[PDB]
Design a protein around this nucleic acid. Structure first.
Ligand code: NA
Ligand code: NA
Length: 327
DNA sequence: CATCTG
DNA sequence: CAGATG
């Protein structure tokens, strides 16, 4: 956690690069396990040879560790931090809708900058056009003071559309947290379930509303259960318009809400432990259910959840307010 | 994992 | 349809 941090980060930068630039998925994987395993390792790695002892770690890495340990740097790390090409890729990728692949094409196409991009909007898809348009906003964090004002509007509108809707805002928003990265809304209705053969309107109906009033301003994507888009806090008394923010809506068959809601809530850490305990309590949990565990190794059957309460009960645990769902 | 592209 | 992005 700090005894072998430099080494671990390195491997990360390294991993990163194999993946992002080179298409070295394998190598890229290679770095990751390594960092993962040095991660656990309890002592002060005092050498490569030492490290090699580790599973996951070979000669090439071990070699790298040496140079690192030996001198506060690594030539490869050095070169990769300079190379304006590889910098391009990390950069472009900062745009929504641009990943590595795209990033690489564009570069070899000669686009490595923001302006580069605008000059050739023509070359981007709807998402990326969008992404370029909001780069700034996209990067800005979401403050709860705003977060609240937004959830206010959402809930009120889903409500009008139909009193039977059930919306919930997950994320760290839900955990407590002062700011957040994007609005994530969970969505359901009684009239939609595991078996219930669909209902698309269920989703497009609300979406409609939001936009109706100008809260939803642009579309990243819109399926029949998921919608990725752009909302915006109606600017008040003209002088201070707000940042544009990523928001997502997702339909769920009622019978599987709470686990969803549980799960999207977090923390990643929380889930695990909670999940680990579920298992101890002879249970299994995932994004959708809670099944009694058979001793044969495994076994099925989704247990019924009417709330987040139902789940805890099951695993016979302390009901956790979202705040303390941290770790 | 769902949606988009082409 | 494969392949990419989130
Ligand atoms: Na991107
Ligand atoms: Na293939």
């Amino acid at each position: 956690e700090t005894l072998n941090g430099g080494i671990t980060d390195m491997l990360t930068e390294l991993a990163n690069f194999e993946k992002n630039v080179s298409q070295a998925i394998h190598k890229y994987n290679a770095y990751r396990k390594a960092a993962s395993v040095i991660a656990k390792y309890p002592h002060k790695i005092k050498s490569g040879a030492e490290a090699k002892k580790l599973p996951g770690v070979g000669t090439k890495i071990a070699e790298k560790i040496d140079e690192f340990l030996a001198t506060g740097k690594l030539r490869k790390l050095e070169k990769i931090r300079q190379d304006d090409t590889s910098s391009s890729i990390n950069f472009l990728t900062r745009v929504s809708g641009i990943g590595p692949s795209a990033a690489r094409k564009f570069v070899d196409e000669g686009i490595k900058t923001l302006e580069d991009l605008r000059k050739n909007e023509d070359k981007l898809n709807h998402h990326q056009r969008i992404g370029l348009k909001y780069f700034g906003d996209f990067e800005k964090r979401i403050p709860r003071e705003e977060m609240l004002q937004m959830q206010d509007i959402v809930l009120n509108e889903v409500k009008k559309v139909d009193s039977e809707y059930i919306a919930t805002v997950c994320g760290s928003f839900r955990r407590g947290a002062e700011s957040s990265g994007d609005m994530d809304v969970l969505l359901t209705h009684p009239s939609f379930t595991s078996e219930s053969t669909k209902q698309p309107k269920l989703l497009h109906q609300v979406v409609e509303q939001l936009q109706k009033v100008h809260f939803i301003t642009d579309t990243l994507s819109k399926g029949e259960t998921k919608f990725m888009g752009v909302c915006q806090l109606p600017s008040k008394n003209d002088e201070k318009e707000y940042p544009h923010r990523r928001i997502d809506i997702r339909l769920i068959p009622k019978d599987q809400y709470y686990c969803g809601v549980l799960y999207f809530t977090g923390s990643d850490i929380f889930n695990k432990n909670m999940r680990a305990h579920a298992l101890e309590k002879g249970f299994t949990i995932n994004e959708y259910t809670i099944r009694p565990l058979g001793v044969t190794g495994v076994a099925g059957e989704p247990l019924p959840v009417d709330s987040e309460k139902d789940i805890f009960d099951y695993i016979q645990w302390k009901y956790r307010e979202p705040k303390d769902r941290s770790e």
